[PDB]
Design a protein around this ligand. Structure first.
Ligand code: BCL
Ligand code: BCL
Ligand code: BCL
Ligand code: BCL
Ligand SMILES: CC[C@H]1c2cc3[nH]c4c(c3C)C(=O)[C@H](C(=O)OC)c4c3nc(cc4[nH]c(cc(n2)[C@@H]1C)c(C(C)=O)c4C)[C@@H](C)[C@@H]3CCC(=O)OC/C=C(/C)CCC[C@@H](C)CCC[C@H](C)CCCC(C)C
Ligand SMILES: CC[C@H]1c2cc3[nH]c4c(c3C)C(=O)[C@H](C(=O)OC)c4c3nc(cc4[nH]c(cc(n2)[C@@H]1C)c(C(C)=O)c4C)[C@@H](C)[C@@H]3CCC(=O)OC/C=C(\C)CCC[C@H](C)CCC[C@H](C)CCCC(C)C
Ligand SMILES: COC1=C(OC)C(=O)C(C/C=C(\C)CC/C=C(\C)CC/C=C(\C)CC/C=C(\C)CC/C=C(\C)CC/C=C(\C)CC/C=C(\C)CC/C=C(\C)CC/C=C(\C)CCC=C(C)C)=C(C)C1=O
Ligand SMILES: COC1=C(OC)C(=O)C(C/C=C(\C)CC/C=C(\C)CC/C=C(\C)CC/C=C(\C)CC/C=C(\C)CC/C=C(\C)CC/C=C(\C)CC/C=C(\C)CC/C=C(\C)CCC=C(C)C)=C(C)C1=O
Ligand SMILES: COC(C)(C)C(=O)C/C=C(\C)CC/C=C(\C)CC/C=C(\C)CCCC/C(C)=C/CC[C@H](C)CC/C=C(\C)CCC=C(C)C
Ligand SMILES: CCCCCCCCCCCC[N+](C)(C)[O-]
Ligand SMILES: CCCCCCCCCCCC[N+](C)(C)[O-]
Ligand SMILES: CCCCCCCCCCCC[N+](C)(C)[O-]
Ligand SMILES: CCCCCCCCCCCC[N+](C)(C)[O-]
Ligand SMILES: [Fe+3]
Lengths: 281, 240, 302
């Protein structure tokens, strides 16, 4: 079925691979070569997870867990039942994510729009790759990656963090959290603003962008503007994931001690390290 | 206990919220249609919301959605297959016809207004006090198309008054007439304005405006559609 | 190279805009601040004007009193030495009264009395600011969405420093005013309650926080992608749908099978964000009042 205004946009072209071969839709869904690649990688990955579930002796969804090879295998292959499945599923996951992005590129070309969506999504992919590929390779074993399970991946979060004490002390993690909280702040305000203009007090006419700018200047003395808030939302979000990836890439590699102790470089700066008083003297 | 009651309640609230949200997002484009324009059999499990009405500013009327919908323009395309789901090929010139990535919507043929009731966008020459405050001033630069040929020169900047931003470059062609180019589709360089979406012979085809000091929503859509359309349709003439 | 619209290529400036009048008492609006070329490459160059009425002055005054009260205490703990102040800035902390003082205000200044003073100022600062967000919208004839959304953030803040301490019977349960100490309090609160990873509201809260970034990345990128058709002029695209709104919708329909409208995406946005502190405040409120250990609670109820 089509949205009432959709037919004019469903023309041939924009594909990156295959010419017109996969240039078609299935209901609402655009296919393309990458829609086919995505299905392949996703189906295979799901099969391997099912298979992993039989060898684990449970079909319970919140018990299933696919673990990476143990540290002793380093960065080499591992028997299926002992981490090789995890290795293959990871190749499949990566294949699917990348394929999804490329399928986004083909939709962009057909529609004549900018490539910002796929670009932004690539930041999420990079975060994923940082945890299952870059950090593990740099550290020397696949075992440092997180396991594929609903609750077990959370155990890995706590166990990894606590290996360095209170993870709140990683300076890159602080910045990342700041972008996350700031992002939610900006999203709520943005949503609220536009809606407050489109849905004014009962019986009044729709407000205008000028009322939006005015509301914000009245309140805090500044309005970033309609274009600017969209650029900001984009930046905040991407920055949060960039700093997240960074906070983890440097943990276990350039820094492997307790994160609280890293802050001593500041306390023991020559010009104040020995002055009595305060908390650190 | 109390925590279990709270979480269970929360999941019920969430399901109602998603239901409300999805229905609010069906206010345009529905009901779904078959490729021939008739109502599709299967509309999905969510019903169309009760209509709501927006009172438009400056005596422009009302808008009630969902409402009866139509393209309100001819669509020059034809089927390429006997079954649903394949592409529809342009029957003439897609740029001219306004289809595909060259598509435009039949918006009102009135200019967008600011909060005071004046035209939101105006040529800089008619906007008292407005000047280029930073960056390279494009006014006076030659405009180059993707074929690397010069198609004209910049004679003005159309600015959004309320938002204080440059929205279009007004370019003059060989014949002395002008055309608007969206600021988002040009690259301002030190000795020229570069336009990747169109080759030099396609500039004349850019839709023209009625009044020389104002642009309607309908014209912005035609102009912006046509320019974006060149990324696909002027491709043969693009160099590298 | 193709232009992305992340930064403007050319800036344009005109007379300062004093804004819409509607029912705003103009005597209370300052004059226009300077224009910022720096800011103008990303958004608007204009600074000011600002509206500063009674509620605004009150809020700004309490706000500073709150900040200054914590600040002198930091000076005090630093032994008035500037070098020690800068050195140990993140380590200082204005802590709540000890558990023995319960919910009373008897606590000696140096042992939590000053904490309550700072909190009182913070309470007025924030609530007056909330009243301000409601009133500034009213004066312009706008809906109250901003005030309602702000109220969701206030809910978490209220639970953490007011409601939960009250229900537990002591001000010692409140968050301390310090950089490193409020982090330590955060880690400690989880340990003491059997690990928040077992609190279902905490996990929901996380899903909305992550969802908020996913959603704004999606939304932000969509709008820049269709800005070549005037996409960021959302109010007019709502009133009279253009090709920007149509290709924005179709991108997503073709990608994931469904789509939003230009107005509808803002409803998804406001709820995604607000649900973060809504669920969060519920999860914290229930901690130690009704549920002592989340791990324990989860082995039974679930
Ligand atoms: C949610 C669970 C915990 C908690 C867990 C964490 C964790 C974990 C982290 C923070 C981080 C921060 N938290 Mg905390 N935080 C809590 C509740 C609060 C409250 C509150 C009134 O309830 C406040 C004011 C803060 C304040 C802060 C900032 C110091 C810092 C960045 C916040 C931010 O970017 O917002 C975005 C908003 C804006 C951009 C607007 C204002 C921005 C500035 C920074 C406002 C700060 C207020 C003021 C007190 C700054 C002190 C200045 C000193 C002179 C340095 N937290 C609760 C108790 N918070 C991060 C950090 O860096 O700690 C050092 C961090 O990693
Ligand atoms: C990001 C930092 C840590 C991490 C820390 C946490 C913490 C801490 C928490 C989660 C939580 C969640 N995480 Mg995790 N998580 C990580 C990496 C991942 C990856 C991944 C491939 O990288 C995935 C798919 C998930 C998936 C999930 C969801 C099961 C759950 C809700 C997230 C959400 O709403 O997000 C935002 C996105 C949306 C709102 C869009 C909807 C996305 C849906 C819900 C994802 C479901 C997919 C899932 C069921 C598995 C796919 C199965 C295959 C199709 C077969 N996490 C890394 C290792 N994650 C929360 C939880 O409740 O777990 C029980 C939780 O508290
Ligand atoms: C006890 C645990 C420690 C701790 C240890 C860690 C550890 C360990 C990690 C973090 C990481 C993070 N922590 Mg920490 N953290 C703690 C306390 C906090 C607090 C808090 C208020 O106290 C906060 C706010 C945070 C905040 C954060 C974020 C900055 C960051 C997670 C987001 C992210 O990386 O996304 C990135 C997004 C993704 C990886 C998702 C990628 C999705 C992919 C590309 C697509 C999925 C497709 C899906 C399968 C399809 C489904 C299809 C259909 C829907 C089914 N932490 C405590 C102190 N923190 C994580 C991080 O930084 O990772 C880089 C990390 O690994
Ligand atoms: C070791 C610690 C525990 C833990 C302990 C806690 C505790 C304790 C809490 C959270 C909370 C949260 N945690 Mg946790 N958390 C852990 C692991 C994680 C992980 C992770 C990767 O595993 C993640 C992603 C998170 C993520 C999150 C958030 C979803 C949530 C806070 C939302 C928020 O926006 O607050 C930021 C927003 C606010 C605090 C509201 C502030 C509003 C006020 C009104 C602002 C005042 C401003 C003031 C006037 C200053 C002005 C300055 C300006 C310059 C003017 N946690 C581990 C397991 N987490 C909170 C919660 O909701 O849990 C249910 C909370 O209390
Ligand atoms: C829905 C969830 C999110 C959310 C939403 C949200 N927050 C909001 C709102 C909304 C919808 C508002 O409307 C409101 C706002 O008005 O935004 C602009 C607010 C807001 N959220 C704020 C911050 C904030 N929000 C946070 C969180 C979140 N808010 C969530 C993620 C956090 C976190 C993450 O910790 C913070 C820190 C404020 C910007 C604003 C409310 C401001 C307020 O209440 O003001 C108090 C008044 C004061 C004057 C305090 C002054 C204190 C000093 C630090 C001023 C500077 C001192 C100076 C440097 C000294 C000068 C020396 C002298 C000689 C002058
Ligand atoms: C960079 C900023 C943020 C962001 C942005 C972002 N995400 C995006 C996009 C953008 C712009 C998209 O365009 C794309 C999208 O289509 O959304 C609808 C996407 C998307 N983000 C998604 C999820 C997601 N994004 C997340 C995060 C974030 N996304 C950031 C916070 C998270 C987090 C926070 O956890 C999740 C869960 C998807 C909804 C969607 C991409 C969907 C997709 O890639 O489909 C291809 C894959 C499949 C159909 C399934 C493959 C199955 C595998 C082969 C096997 C399973 C393996 C897996 C590792 C299991 C893990 C189990 C877990 C319990 C750990
Ligand atoms: C219509 O109008 C408007 C709206 O509408 C709806 C709005 O919503 C809003 C609302 C918007 C906001 C409040 C946004 C405020 C944002 C900012 C000031 C910018 C980002 C803010 C942050 C708090 C970011 C987090 C904190 C920090 C310190 C960033 C640090 C940056 C660095 C580059 C650090 C440098 C270090 C590096 C690269 C190395 C790091 C490595 C190790 C430490 C190791 C506004 C203003 C508006 O006007
Ligand atoms: C103003 O503008 C905007 C719009 O519109 C005008 C929009 O819509 C959107 C999009 C946003 C929304 C619709 C709001 C709600 C969205 C979210 C909360 C984000 C979370 C999304 C999801 C959980 C959906 C996930 C579903 C996915 C990724 C696909 C599900 C897929 C399948 C069952 C099939 C998989 C498809 C394949 C394999 C490809 C090929 C298919 C074959 C059959 C072959 C945005 C951002 C926007 O800003
Ligand atoms: C440069 O030096 C000078 C002196 C000039 C300065 O001014 C420097 C000042 C600084 C160094 C100040 C530093 C301030 C901090 C670093 C601030 C950090 C604060 C936190 C991280 C706060 C986090 C959380 C706080 C919360 C959750 C507070 C909640 C408060 C309440 C909900 C209010 C409750 C009300 C109370 C209990 C009183 C009720 C009484 C009634 C009568 C109603
Ligand atoms: C903390 C978020 C909002 C605070 C920003 C308000 C800035 C105050 C501006 C003071 C200048 C005003 N004055 C006195 C000249 O009118
Ligand atoms: C199944 C019944 C669930 C009851 C709650 C349903 C959630 C309603 C969503 C809020 C409605 C929004 N609105 C229009 C007031 O903004
Ligand atoms: C967490 C968000 C979950 C999204 C769920 C929304 C349901 C999608 C249903 C849309 C079906 C509409 N359609 C194709 C009939 O138009
Ligand atoms: C408004 C958007 C709705 C998105 C809803 C996403 C919910 C994801 C499910 C998280 C499951 C959490 N848990 C463990 C706390 O129950
Ligand atoms: Fe928007």
């Amino acid at each position: 079925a089509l949205l009432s205004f959709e037919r004019k946009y469903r023309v041939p072209g924009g594909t990156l691979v295959g010419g017109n071969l996969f240039d078609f839709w299935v209901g609402p869904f655009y296919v393309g070569f990458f829609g086919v690649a995505t299905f392949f990688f996703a189906a295979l990955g799901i099969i391997l997870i099912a298979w992993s579930a039989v060898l684990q002796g449970t079909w319970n969804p919140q018990l299933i867990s696919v673990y990476p090879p143990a540290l002793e295998y380093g960065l080499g292959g591992a028997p299926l039942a002992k981490g090789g499945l995890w290795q293959i599923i990871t190749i499949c996951a990566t294949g699917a994510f990348v394929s999804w992005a490329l399928r986004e590129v083909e939709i962009c070309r057909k529609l004549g729009i900018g490539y910002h969506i796929p670009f932004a999504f690539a930041f999420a992919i990079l975060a994923y790759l940082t945890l299952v590929l870059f950090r593990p390779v740099m550290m020397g074993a696949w075992g440092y990656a997180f396991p594929y399970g609903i609750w077990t991946h959370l155990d890995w979060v706590s166990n990894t963090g606590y290996t360095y004490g209170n993870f709140h002390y990683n300076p890159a993690h602080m910045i990342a959290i700041s972008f996350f909280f700031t992002n939610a702040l900006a999203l709520a305000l943005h949503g609220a603003l536009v809606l407050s203009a489109a849905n004014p007090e009962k019986g009044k006419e729709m407000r205008t962008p000028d009322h939006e700018d005015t509301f914000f200047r009245d309140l805090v003395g500044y309005s970033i503007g309609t274009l600017g808030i969209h650029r900001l939302g984009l930046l905040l979000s991407l920055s949060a994931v960039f700093f997240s990836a960074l906070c983890m890439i440097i943990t276990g590699t350039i820094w492997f001690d307790q994160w609280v102790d890293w802050w001593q470089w500041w306390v023991k700066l020559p010009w104040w390290a020995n002055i009595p008083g305060g908390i650190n003297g | 206990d109390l925590a279990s009651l709270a979480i269970y309640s929360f999941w019920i609230f969430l399901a109602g919220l998603i239901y409300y949200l999805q229905t609010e997002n069906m206010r345009e484009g529905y009901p779904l249609e078959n490729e021939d324009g008739t109502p599709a059999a299967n509309q999905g499990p969510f019903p169309l919301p009760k209509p709501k009405t927006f009172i438009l500013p400056h005596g422009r009327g009302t808008l009630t959605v969902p409402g009866p919908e139509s393209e309100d323009r001819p669509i020059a395309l034809a089927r390429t297959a006997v079954s649903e789901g394949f592409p529809h090929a342009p029957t003439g010139d897609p740029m001219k016809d306004g289809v595909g990535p060259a598509s435009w919507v039949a918006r009102r043929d009135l200019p967008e207004l600011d909060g005071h009731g004046h035209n939101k966008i105006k040529p800089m020459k008619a906007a008292a006090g407005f000047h280029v405050s930073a960056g390279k001033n494009p006014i006076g630069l030659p405009v180059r198309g993707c074929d690397l040929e010069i198609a004209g020169k910049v004679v003005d900047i159309w600015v959004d008054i309320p938002e204080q931003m440059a929205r279009f470059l007004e370019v003059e062609l060989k014949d002395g007439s002008t055309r608007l180019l969206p600021m988002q589709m040009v690259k301002v360089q030190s000795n020229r304005v570069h336009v990747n979406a169109l080759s030099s012979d396609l500039f004349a085809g850019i839709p023209t405006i009625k009044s020389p000091t104002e642009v309607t929503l309908l014209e912005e859509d035609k102009i912006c559609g046509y320019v974006a359309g060149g990324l696909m349709y002027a491709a043969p003439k693009r160099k590298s | 190279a193709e232009y992305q619209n992340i930064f403007s290529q050319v800036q344009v400036r005109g007379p300062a805009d004093l804004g819409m009048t509607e029912d705003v008492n103009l005597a209370n609006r300052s004059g226009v601040g300077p224009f910022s070329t720096l800011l103008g490459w990303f958004g608007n160059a204009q600074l000011g004007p600002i509206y500063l009425g009674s509620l605004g002055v009150l809020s700004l005054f309490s706000g500073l009193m709150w900040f200054f009260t914590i600040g002198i205490w930091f000076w005090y703990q630093a032994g008035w030495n500037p070098a020690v102040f800068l050195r140990d800035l993140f380590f200082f902390s204005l802590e709540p009264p000890a558990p023995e003082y319960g919910l009373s205000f008897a606590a000696p200044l140096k042992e939590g009395g000053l904490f309550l003073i700072a909190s009182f100022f913070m309470f007025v600062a924030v609530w007056s600011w909330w009243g301000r967000t409601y009133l500034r919208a009213q004066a312009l004839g706008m809906g109250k969405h901003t005030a309602w959304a702000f109220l969701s953030a206030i809910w978490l803040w209220m639970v953490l420093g007011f409601i939960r301490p009250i229900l537990m019977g002591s001000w010692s349960e409140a968050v301390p005013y310090g950089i490193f100490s409020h982090l330590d309090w955060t880690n400690n609160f989880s340990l003491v309650h059997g690990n928040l990873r077992y609190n279902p509201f905490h996990g929901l809260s996380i899903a909305f926080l992550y969802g908020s970034a996913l959603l704004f990345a999606m939304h932000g990128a969509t709008i820049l992608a269709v800005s070549r058709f005037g996409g960021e002029r959302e109010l007019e695209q709502i009133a009279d749908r253009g090709t920007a709104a149509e290709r924005a919708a179709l991108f997503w329909r073709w990608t994931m099978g469904f789509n939003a409208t230009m107005e509808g995406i803002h409803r998804w946005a406001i709820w995604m964000a607000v649900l973060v502190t809504l669920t969060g405040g519920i999860g914290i409120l229930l901690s130690g009042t009704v549920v002592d250990n989340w791990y324990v609670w989860g082995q039974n109820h679930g």
